[PDB]
Every structure is written in C-alpha cells, then in structure tokens.
Amino acid sequence: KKEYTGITYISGPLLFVENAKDLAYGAIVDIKDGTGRVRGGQVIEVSEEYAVIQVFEETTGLDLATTSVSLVEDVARLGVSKEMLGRRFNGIGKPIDGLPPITPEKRLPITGLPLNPVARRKPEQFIQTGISTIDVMNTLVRGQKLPIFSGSGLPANEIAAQIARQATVRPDLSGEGEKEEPFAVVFAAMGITQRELSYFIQEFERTGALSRSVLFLNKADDPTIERILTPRMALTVAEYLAFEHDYHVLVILTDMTNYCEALREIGAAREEIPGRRGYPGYMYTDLATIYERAGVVEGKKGSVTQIPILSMPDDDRTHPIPDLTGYITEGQIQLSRELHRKGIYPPIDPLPSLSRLMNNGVGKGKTREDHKQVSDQLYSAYANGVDIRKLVAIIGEDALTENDRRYLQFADAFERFFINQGQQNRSIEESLQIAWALLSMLPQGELKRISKDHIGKYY
Amino acid sequence: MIQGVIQKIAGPAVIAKGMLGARMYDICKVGEEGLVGEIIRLDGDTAFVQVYEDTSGLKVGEPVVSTGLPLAVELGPGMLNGIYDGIQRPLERIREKTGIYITRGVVVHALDREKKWAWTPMVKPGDEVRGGMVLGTVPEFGFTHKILVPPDVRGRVKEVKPAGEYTVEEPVVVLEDGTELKMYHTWPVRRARPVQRKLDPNTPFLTGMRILDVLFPVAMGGTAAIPGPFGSGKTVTQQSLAKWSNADVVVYVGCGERGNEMTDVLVEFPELTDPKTGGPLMHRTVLIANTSNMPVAAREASIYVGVTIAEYFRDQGFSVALMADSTSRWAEALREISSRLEEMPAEEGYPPYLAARLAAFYERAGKVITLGGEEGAVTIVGAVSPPGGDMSEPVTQSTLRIVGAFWRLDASLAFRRHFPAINWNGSYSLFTSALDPWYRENVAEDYPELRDAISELLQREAGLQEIVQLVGPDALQDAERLVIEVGRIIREDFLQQNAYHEVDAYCSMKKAYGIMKMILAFYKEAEAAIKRGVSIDEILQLPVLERIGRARYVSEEEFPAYFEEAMKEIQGAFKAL
Amino acid sequence: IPGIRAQIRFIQQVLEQREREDTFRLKRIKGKIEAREAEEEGG
Numbered sequence A: 001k002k003e004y005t006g007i008t009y010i011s012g013p014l015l016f017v018e019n020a021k022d023l024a025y026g027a028i029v030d031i032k033d034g035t036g037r038v039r040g041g042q043v044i045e046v047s048e049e050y051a052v053i054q055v056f057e058e059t060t061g062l063d064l065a066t067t068s069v070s071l072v073e074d075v076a077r078l079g080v081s082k083e084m085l086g087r088r089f090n091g092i093g094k095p096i097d098g099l100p101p102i103t104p105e106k107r108l109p110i111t112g113l114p115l116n117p118v119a120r121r122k123p124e125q126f127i128q129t130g131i132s133t134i135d136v137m138n139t140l141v142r143g144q145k146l147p148i149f150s151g152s153g154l155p156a157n158e159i160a161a162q163i164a165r166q167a168t169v170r171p172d173l174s175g176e177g178e179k180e181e182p183f184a185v186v187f188a189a190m191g192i193t194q195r196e197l198s199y200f201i202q203e204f205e206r207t208g209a210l211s212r213s214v215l216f217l218n219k220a221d222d223p224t225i226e227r228i229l230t231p232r233m234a235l236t237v238a239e240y241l242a243f244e245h246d247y248h249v250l251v252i253l254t255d256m257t258n259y260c261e262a263l264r265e266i267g268a269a270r271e272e273i274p275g276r277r278g279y280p281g282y283m284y285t286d287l288a289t290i291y292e293r294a295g296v297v298e299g300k301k302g303s304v305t306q307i308p309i310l311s312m313p314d315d316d317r318t319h320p321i322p323d324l325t326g327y328i329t330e331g332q333i334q335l336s337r338e339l340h341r342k343g344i345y346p347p348i349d350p351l352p353s354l355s356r357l358m359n360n361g362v363g364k365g366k367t368r369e370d371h372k373q374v375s376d377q378l379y380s381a382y383a384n385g386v387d388i389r390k391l392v393a394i395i396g397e398d399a400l401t402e403n404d405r406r407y408l409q410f411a412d413a414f415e416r417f418f419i420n421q422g423q424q425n426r427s428i429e430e431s432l433q434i435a436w437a438l439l440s441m442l443p444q445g446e447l448k449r450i451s452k453d454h455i456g457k458y459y
Numbered sequence B: 001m002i003q004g005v006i007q008k009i010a011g012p013a014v015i016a017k018g019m020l021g022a023r024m025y026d027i028c029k030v031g032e033e034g035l036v037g038e039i040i041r042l043d044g045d046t047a048f049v050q051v052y053e054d055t056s057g058l059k060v061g062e063p064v065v066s067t068g069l070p071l072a073v074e075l076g077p078g079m080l081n082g083i084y085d086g087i088q089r090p091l092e093r094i095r096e097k098t099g100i101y102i103t104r105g106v107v108v109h110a111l112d113r114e115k116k117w118a119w120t121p122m123v124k125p126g127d128e129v130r131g132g133m134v135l136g137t138v139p140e141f142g143f144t145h146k147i148l149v150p151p152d153v154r155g156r157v158k159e160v161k162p163a164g165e166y167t168v169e170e171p172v173v174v175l176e177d178g179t180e181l182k183m184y185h186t187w188p189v190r191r192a193r194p195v196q197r198k199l200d201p202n203t204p205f206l207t208g209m210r211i212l213d214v215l216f217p218v219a220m221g222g223t224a225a226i227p228g229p230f231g232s233g234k235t236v237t238q239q240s241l242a243k244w245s246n247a248d249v250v251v252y253v254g255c256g257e258r259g260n261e262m263t264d265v266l267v268e269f270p271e272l273t274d275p276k277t278g279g280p281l282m283h284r285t286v287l288i289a290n291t292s293n294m295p296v297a298a299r300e301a302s303i304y305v306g307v308t309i310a311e312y313f314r315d316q317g318f319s320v321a322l323m324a325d326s327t328s329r330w331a332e333a334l335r336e337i338s339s340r341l342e343e344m345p346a347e348e349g350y351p352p353y354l355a356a357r358l359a360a361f362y363e364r365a366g367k368v369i370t371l372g373g374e375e376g377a378v379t380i381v382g383a384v385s386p387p388g389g390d391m392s393e394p395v396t397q398s399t400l401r402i403v404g405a406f407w408r409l410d411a412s413l414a415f416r417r418h419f420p421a422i423n424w425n426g427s428y429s430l431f432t433s434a435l436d437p438w439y440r441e442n443v444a445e446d447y448p449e450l451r452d453a454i455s456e457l458l459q460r461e462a463g464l465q466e467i468v469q470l471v472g473p474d475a476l477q478d479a480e481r482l483v484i485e486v487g488r489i490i491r492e493d494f495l496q497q498n499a500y501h502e503v504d505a506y507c508s509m510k511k512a513y514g515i516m517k518m519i520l521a522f523y524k525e526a527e528a529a530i531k532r533g534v535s536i537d538e539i540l541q542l543p544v545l546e547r548i549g550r551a552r553y554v555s556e557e558e559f560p561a562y563f564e565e566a567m568k569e570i571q572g573a574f575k576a577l
Numbered sequence C: 001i002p003g004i005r006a007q008i009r010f011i012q013q014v015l016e017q018r019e020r021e022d023t024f025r026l027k028r029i030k031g032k033i034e035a036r037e038a039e040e041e042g043g
C-alpha cells in the first residue's frame, strides 16, 4: 500500500492530508518520503475534509510533492510475549539489541481498558526495603504506587537502585509460603541522559537482576512524542506479565517531567486552552490514565506496584506536575536538599512524605504489635524538635528549659542515626530496636501516644 | 427518530450532520455500536454530540440515531446495597458479563427484572389518587420501601393487584384513564422533585467527631465543604461520616477518586454493624463509583444521578445523607468540554457558568415536607480540592457564600500527624444558634455556656501566642503561661481523635460535655491557686493532668462513673496543696 | 521589615506578570474565533 498522497501543510509536529476519511480516529500511519526513509505518525481529529497527523521522529526532508502516508493498524497495539523477559527495547518498541524481533503470543491495545472497581482487592502484604525511614514510618506495601519527589542534584537514581536491589517480602512474619517470590523489574526511562543510563545499567548488571527485567530506553537525543508513547508500552507489558503469568512486577518510571513536557508541547502546537501555568487542561486525565494501571485483582495472584521518579522543577510542591501527581497517587517520598548538604544518606525528609495504604499492611499479626505507635510518637517528637530549632534561632541556646534541650538533642540524634544509614540492608526488627533506643532518650510518661503495656515491655 | 451521520469525530466529542429537529439535551446513540452521548449545540443542521465512552477506533460515515429523552434514571425497589456506574449501570452485572475490565457498549438495566418482591395492597378501587401519594409497600432488607405515584399524574384507581409476589414489571395499579403504574418510574436528572414547602432546620446531624459536633455543628438540612490540599484527609473524614452518622440511608458519590479508595468500602462495609438496627452497614448504602480513568462526562452525570436518588429517598420519607467527593473534578470536566467547544473562558479556564451549576446543585438540599405529608432531609458534604491549596480558586470561592458550615483543613497539622487537621480559626458555622433549644433539651442545661467558654478560651489564647512567638514563652507572666498551657491541653485532649482506635472513634454528646466540664473545672481551680501563689510547674506536675488527658480512651459505659471520680479527685487535689 | 517588603514586591510582580500572558492568549483566541465564524455562513 502507498495510498493517501496529497498532504497540504507541514509545521513542526503536525502534518495535514487532503480528503481521507477511511483513516480511523487514533490510527497508526507511516510516512514514506522521496528517498525511502519511513517515519511514524498517529491520526488525531479525523474529519470529512482533512485529517491531522502527529509525526514521531521528525519532519526534515519531507516535501509536499513526493510524500505519502499509509495505514498500518486501526488501533495502537503492542505485540507482547513472555520471551521478552531478558530483552531491551526503545520507545515505540523496536529492539535496540543484536537479536531479531520476537514472535508474539497475543497483541493487545496500549491505550486503556481500566480495571473494574469490583474486581480488585485491598493490598495487604508488606514488602520491606531496608531503608528505616520507609520501613518504619512510610510503609510500602505490595500493590501501591509511591513516587519519589526528587530534585536537581539530589540522589534519586541511587535510591531507586537500592530499593530495587534490597526489596523482598517477609512471608515468615504473617504465615505464607517461605521461599517463592523474586521480583521482575520493568524499568522504563524517558529522557535520561547518558551518565544516568550508564549508572543504571552498570548497577543492574552488577546484581544479576538483568536477566529478569525488560528495558525501554528513550535517551535525550531522541524525539519527544516517543516519550509520549513509552510508558503506555511499559505498563502494557507489566499488566500482561502480571495478570497472565502470576508474576510480581515493579515498574520504575523515570522522569515524568519529560513526559509532561512532551504533553505540553503537543498541546501548545494544538492551541488547546492552557489549564494552569502552561500545561493543558487534560493533564490530570492523562497522568491518571497511566497511573491507575497498578493494583491487585481477586482470584489471580499477580501484583503491579510503581515507583514514579519525578524531579519537582524549582523545589515547589505547588508546581502543577507534583501537585497533580500527589492528588492521583497514594503516598509519596520526598528528598531534602538541606539534608543532602550535611552528608546524610538517604536524605529522605520524613515529615512531608506519607503513605496511605499503610494502616492496612502493618500492625498486630503482620509485622509487630507496636509499629504504628512508634511511628506516631517519632513524628510528634521530631516535630517538637524542629520547632525548638526556631525557638533557639530566636532566643539563644542557653536560655532554654531543661527539657527543650532534650527535644533538641533527640532531633539531632534522629537525623544522625535513624536517617543516615549508608548502603546497608537493615531489617524491620533492627530498625525498630534503633527507634526504641532513640525514644528511650526522652523520659517516660511524656509519650502520650504509646500504651503503658508496650511502654513497660520495651525501653 | 432523527438519523444522521458523523462528520468531525475528534477526541471525546463528535459532530453529526443531517440532524434537523433534535432537541437540545436529549441522548443520542452515536457510532455503529451505540456509545450514548448528549447534544450540546445546534448549528444549522449539525449537532455536537458529547460521548460518554472512549471513541478510539470510530470512523466517518457511521450513523447516529436520536432518542428524544434527556437522561432519565430508574427509581424503585432494588437500589440499596449495590454499586453503579456514572450513568447507572450495575457494576456487579458488568463484571460477571464481560470480565475484570470495563469495555464499551454494555446494555444492562438499572433495577433487576427477575427477583420477586412482596407486594402489599394499600388502595381501594374507586379512590382518588394524586402525585406523590402512597400505593403499596415492598419489604427490602430492613426497610419498608414504599412505592409512589409519579408526579404530574392523577385519575381514579380502577383495579389493583391483590397481595402476592411479582417482578417490577407487572402493573400493580391501573387507573381509569388507562395509564398503568409499574413498581418503578423514570425521572430526568436535571430537574428537581417538587415538594409542598421547606421547613427550617432545628436538629443536629451527629457525626461522631468532637470538633465537627461541639464546635462547628450542622443542622439536619444543611451543607458543608471540606477543602484542603492533598494529604489532609478529605476521604477519611467522609468515610467516617458515612460509617458513624445518625442518618437512615447514605449515598457515597465518588467523582474522580481512587479505585483502591472505592474498593476499600465494598469490602469492609458488609462486615460492620450500623448503629441503629444491628444489621450490616451495606444495607443502607447506594454508592456510585466513577474513578479517574473512566470517561470524562460521566463525572457530571454521576453527580446529578446521586442527587436525584437522594431526593427520591427524601420524598419517600427517610433521612438521607449525600456525600459528594471532590466537586473540583466536575469543574475540570466542564473545563475540558469548554476547551472542546472552543469558547471564551473566565478566570483560569473554567467556563462562564460554573457558579450557576454549583448553586443549583447545593440548593436542592434541606429538610422538607413532601407531597405525602411526611418529613425528609438531604444533607450534603462536598469535598473540594484546590490546585495549590489556596482558597482563591474560583471553585473554592464560589463554594463559599452558598454553604453553611465550612471545615478548612490545614497542611501543617497534617504533617505533625495531628489528625483531624481542622484549622480551628479559619472554619465557621452558621447553624450554631438555632440548635440551642435542642441542646438544652437533649444534652445538658449549660452546654451552650460551656461551648462559649471553650471557644472564647481558644480564640483568646491565639492572641497571647502571637506575643509568644515574638518574645518567647518565658518572659510571660504566670497567668499568661497558664492560659497557654490550658490551650495546649485542650488542643491535645479534646480536639484530637484517631479514627483507628477501638473506642476513640465515636464520641457522643454526653462524653464530650463531660470532658469539657472537667477541663473548665481544672482551669478554674488552677486560676484560683495561681492567684494564691503556687507555681505553674507544680500546677502542671499535678497528675490530674494525665488523668483528664487519657480520659478520652475510655469506653462509653464506665464513663458516667470515671467522670465523677476524676471530677471529685480534681476538686480535692487542687485544694490539698 | 525591609526583607519582608522585598519579598512582597517580588511575589506581587510575578503575580501581575502572570496575567498579561492570559490576556494575550485570550486575545489570540478571540482573533481565531472571529476568523473562523467569518466563514460559517452555511454548510
């Protein structure tokens, strides 16, 4: 096929064609030019007069005389299989590798089909990470999405690699099959530079966790609409390998800011009523469409859990990207530049980072009967210490009451021993022992959150 | 009736040509498959259908057929204890009919057409019947579900069915003019079920939370709004209002919420026990789920469906309690539809008819005496999500000036893990002056005076806290530091409540009044002792501090004695020294 | 006090800056709507 010639406009991303009504809305095309090089596209806003395309690669060398556009498929769909569990793809899905394409087993769409609110179940199992600021105060369970609000020069890739390497479930603390469950990473990156990509690949190759993970790469010297396409492919593969083959996947989505940028660029070139500070109106819809693809169903036993890394641009929690992401997901982890100055690692600010699906995955019979209570008390004491910091900065350190100094020293010990942990794999019990050691630095009877029984049993 | 073809399908909205005579808001069925939409335009001979589905994969030339009916619902027995979609599709049936996904183009009735019901005659052939009258009764599990005459209908009953067991399709009454009345009927959602006259609210809406019951009350006809940034608890508080209220029925509308947030209700509620009859709690809930990846016009569709169901139950005679979640999603749906219409937007893109819709939706809530001579009530608690937390968004402002209470959530109180994070000086209430007769009749006699004293103490301590932050909380006098410390004791022992304890999750009025009495008596005696000359450090080390502190983790049975013992102990120990 | 006044001045300048962009986009939208409706006599 070489039909549908007679384009009549080219400017940046877009490209128009004259009378063509048999192209279905949202189809896929391929744009051959006068020298054989074939590009890609996607039909938006079909109509009886013309039809607007959205080129993927670029628009260099396309003239208005020798240029055609042909139909490939009436809907976007990726050819998934199980043989793609050691491979490495790019953007749209060609293999950037020395091996031929795969022989598919089923080809499903990449757009949607949400889960039925009655075919779900509450995520309950508990997965520890070895980061005592996430195991003890911001619990991470299996079936929940939890971003990492990074920064410019703050270590977020290192924390993601550490979580991916240390994360393991604890079956012998609630009663389950002892040894059954490794993970399966579906790392999907859109916009990463060369340094960060080389770091990630080195790290994955050091631990041997590469022969059970798929890779979609969209490095920074590539087009942008491919960034618009990549995460849908990733989540399609993940949902397949979970709800069909009983795996437990862990999708790492990197730099959602570049995805939002490509979105804003196509919206601008479309002139579509900017919502708030640039970015168009439907960005909540788009981010939700690619976030809500991670849950757990009943009957099956697979699971899909996410960790979308994203760099809040100017360190503003009020920027539209972090704002909408926080409204959509359930939980968050937030790094701290001030703590990064003082050599702490991981510099996870423990105040503004919460997780919602925690009261159901922790408590008596799952980890230990005193977990959430130590959590509440540690939060209260740290808030008091932080306030007394400002009291000091107003008055002076020698005009302080005898217990305000206790709270101050608790805050400093907390920032120095509980948060800073290097690259070591802790345990829930070691971290709770450290937490109780710290909480014993304060006197008894001034902890109105814990019960007297636990107070007597641990101190 | 009127058939046309598609011309300009683009995004979530199409443009059908060859359609002359189509009304302005009826429901069309676009596409070769049926993708029910809605008309909002009429330009010469085309139309602007607004689809409620995906539209991914259509073409140009596929037919569109009008219906001439503006989005009715189905009102009758069978609604309680069930989920629905935005346009009233049973989620359970769709699940068992397709699988775990939600495909497009599924046709299922709203009310069941197979189960039998226990009819009971209530008329006599030859009587005169008018709209809203009673016709019979059908026992649903725990309630005596009535059946009614659709409004704007009258005649002379000719022959009724005797008792028995029928479906919802057998006409149980046959009027003389030939009109047959089923056990259900349809109602367009954008209208309002008429009444006789609207009464004045004079009884509270007990909800369990000490703050939202003692300080900022809401009458049993009222309205409210819980705005705040993400990470405050605009959902924990609404779920607690849904599981510890005093209403009869509850409708939980989710307009752009989380799938997990809506499935943690379908799983737990058929295990708890409603605090009025003992049955399961899922026998009074009609929740209407519409998550964040389903189609985009189903948002407004779901809001209107929920309000019409609540008004039906009010006309029946119960005391409903609507609960609309995140009305801001409605606003953003309207913004997208406007950006497709290509119109002129007001501030921040929101179309120039936002406030009208919100007012018309908030103004069908209140106690009323319907056409059968009974009483009903529809209370509304609509969450609001500002785009940065600022109370200057058009939705956050237009939702003032129309409501009663207003429960402004604060972010720092939610970072300190101090829940609930109700800011005690940005909120307000307007009902707290018509409920005093009810308080005097059913709680105590000087409960208004105790409430006034508590509020005055809080909102006088604030001024001293200003000077505290200026100078430091040590250059103050003794009475001033006493006021600061009493304020802190209040703030941590009477305005704090953990929704995950076993007995500190439902505090009643007598228990709240008891705690207030203890606090006031302690403050009085401490004032006297400070005048005497004893030191504030000893006054604070008095262990009645910890007694009246932990006095909230008690149950509700031994409190009438615990309170007496602690009261006498305070009165003794603060004159011992 | 002068530091707070400087902060206020900066915030006020940014808030006023982010209204002229809106007025500009609105005027362009109005121009496009006029250009389109100038061709919608019938069809």
Ligand SMILES: Nc1ncnc2c1ncn2[C@@H]1O[C@H](COP(=O)(O)OP(=O)(O)O)[C@@H](O)[C@H]1O
Binding pocket: A354, A355, A356, A357, A359, B229, B230, B231, B232, B233, B234, B235, B236, B237, B419, B420, B497, B498, B499, B500
């Ligand atoms: N009454 C409460 N008691 C204890 N914790 C609460 C209470 N309300 C909210 N929380 C905590 O605050 C968080 C708010 O959750 P959610 O309601 O989903 O977000 P939002 O309040 O922003 O809508 C929850 O994770 C919960 O742990």
